[PDB]
């Protein structure tokens, strides 16, 4: 559950990094999300799918790796709900429950690594008018990292039930 909660918190990230163009111009404070770029006067825009043209093709593959991450988490619940259907073979599907949750986070780390590969390259462009003296990552992306080890701690104890 907690691995699923901070999975969606990555999708519900309203601030991925601060965006600072505090140039002595004047002071500027962006708060770009993972997709939707908020800023502060207070205003929030999208600014999704930026340049160039094969990093966009990365962003095609990035969204696909995001969608496949959360859907494989649901399979871990549905087979363990079939355990409670039989608790109230069994051991094969509960082993299969941790199959897809492990195969969730393996693609999902690359889904996080493709977007850091995005955010490295886009700041390396110095984005069109918003290049920050930040690049303070997350804050939910450090918490989405904690969703990965909460997939892993859930997986080691249900294969421990497989050994018995």
């Amino acid at each position: 559950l907690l691995a699923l909660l901070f999975a969606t918190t990555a999708f519900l990230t309203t601030y991925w990094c601060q965006g600072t163009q505090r140039v002595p111009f004047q002071l500027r404070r962006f708060h770009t999300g993972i997709w939707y770029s908020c800023e502060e006067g207070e205003k929030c825009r999208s600014f999704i799918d930026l340049a160039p043209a094969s990093e966009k093709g990365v962003l095609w593959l990035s969204v696909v790796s995001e969608v496949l991450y959360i859907l494989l988490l649901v399979v871990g619940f549905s087979l363990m709900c079939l355990e409670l259907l039989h608790s109230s073979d069994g051991l094969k599907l509960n082993a299969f429950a941790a199959v897809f949750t492990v195969l969730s986070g393996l693609l999902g780390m690359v889904a996080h690594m493709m977007y850091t590969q995005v955010f490295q390259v886009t700041v390396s462009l110095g984005p069109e008018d918003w290049r920050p003296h930040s690049w303070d990552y997350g804050w939910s992306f450090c918490l989405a990292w904690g969703s990965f080890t909460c997939c892993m701690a859930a997986s080691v104890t249900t294969l421990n039930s497989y050994t018995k």
């Binding site: 393996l106 690359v110 490295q120």
Partner: protein, 390 residues
């Protein structure tokens, strides 16, 4: 005509008066002709902004030629292309500035974001040859008596001292000889990798117009009007006429309206758009900041800027004495070092003295994740067919 760095208006041109409002290469040069030929002068600007082109119907030369043919100007010290149709109407001096059509491209920039950057210190066929040498180890391991010991050739691949050892026969020898062979290569990899992080020379993409005549990955255009568009049309050389065939068949139009539009489209297409313009101006914009554009290759043709007097004026002959005098004195190149390098916004070798890069990027490491996850899919694909063996 107001051209950089030839004739420009000063920052205090409203403060100054007369010829003192002007500045540039030709402004210094006209004072030199006024020094050697000894005459009072007035620097005047052409009205229509034309260099002088003959009409087709009324057959009227406009521009500075129309100021010299029609007597409106006494001499033309200006950047002016000596053409044959201009030769017959006004008398040119011998050319002080030889030039031609040159290749303006972007300066190259470090960007190799993935797997190909990982494979840099060891050549692609050597990646193939090291595996083709590795597979020769396999049956030699089975000559002691194959599928098991190939992992122990991988157990002897670099590190991780293996468990099966063919104790003291010939497999012990050659199993160490291949082991002796491969440890040279990982030291040599790290020696090559450290050198590549050390120097960082930026390799130029193209040299010749024959490079752009063949490739099409980087587009290239000229101005939408001019003798440059006329030249590749008039070029009977099959190299440039193919480039003329290229730019004619370039859809959308690589021909731009202003010169800075081509320079911007060099910068905006990130080096996928090259541009062709005259060498000394291609020198000049390469000196103008941000200096991300550069000139490669020589000129495609010999041209010449020459001082123009009206035809029949005897003043051009001591001018012709003065122009060859200033060239032999080297005043031209010295003012060229002034108005391109001293008055330019970059020192071209000063930034060449400024390249002291630093710490490792992540991008060269993340391309190797694809074959790393490709093993993780191979971890699943081999394991699932084991259930078919179950």
């Amino acid at each position: 005509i107001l051209e950089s760095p030839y004739v420009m208006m000063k920052k205090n041109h409203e403060m100054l008066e007369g010829n003192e409002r002007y500045e540039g290469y030709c402004v210094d040069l006209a004072a030199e002709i006024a020094k050697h030929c000894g005459f009072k002068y007035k620097l005047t600007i052409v009205g229509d902004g034309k260099y002088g082109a003959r009409d087709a119907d009324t057959k009227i030369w406009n521009g500075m030629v129309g100021e010299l043919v029609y007597g409106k100007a006494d001499i033309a010290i200006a950047p002016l292309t000596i053409t044959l149709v201009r030769e017959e109407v006004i008398d040119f001096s011998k050319p002080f500035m030889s030039l031609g059509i040159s290749i303006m491209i972007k300066k190259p920039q470090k960007s190799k974001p993935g797997v190909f950057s990982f494979l840099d210190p060891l050549a692609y066929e050597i990646w193939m040859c090291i595996v083709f040498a590795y597979i020769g180890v396999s049956v030699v391991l089975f000559l002691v008596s194959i599928f098991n010991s190939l992992w122990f050739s991988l157990g002897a691949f670099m590190q991780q001292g293996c468990d099966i050892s063919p104790r003291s026969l010939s497999g012990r020898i050659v199993g160490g000889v291949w082991w002796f062979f491969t440890l040279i290569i990982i030291s040599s990899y790290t020696a090559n990798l450290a050198a590549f992080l050390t120097v960082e020379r930026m390799v130029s993409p193209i040299e010749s117009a024959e490079d752009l005549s063949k490739q099409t990955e980087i587009a290239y255009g000229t101005l939408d009007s001019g003798s440059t568009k006329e030249f590749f049309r008039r070029s009977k050389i099959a190299v440039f006429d193919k480039m003329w065939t290229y730019m004619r068949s370039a859809e959308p139009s690589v021909f731009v309206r202003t010169t800075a539009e081509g320079v911007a489209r060099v910068r905006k297409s990130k080096g996928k758009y090259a541009y062709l313009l005259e060498s000394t101006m291609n020198e000049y914009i390469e000196q103008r900041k941000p200096c991300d554009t550069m000139k490669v290759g020589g000129n495609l043709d010999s041209k010449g800027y020459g001082i123009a007097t009206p035809k029949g004026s005897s003043l051009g002959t001591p001018v012709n004495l003065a122009v060859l005098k200033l060239s032999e004195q080297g005043v031209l190149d010295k003012l060229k070092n002034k108005w391109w390098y001293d008055k330019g916004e970059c020192g071209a070798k000063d930034s060449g003295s400024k390249e002291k890069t630093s710490a490792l990027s992540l991008s060269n490491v993340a391309g190797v994740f694809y074959i790393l996850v490709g093993g993780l899919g191979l971890a699943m694909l081999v394991a699932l067919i084991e259930f078919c063996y179950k």
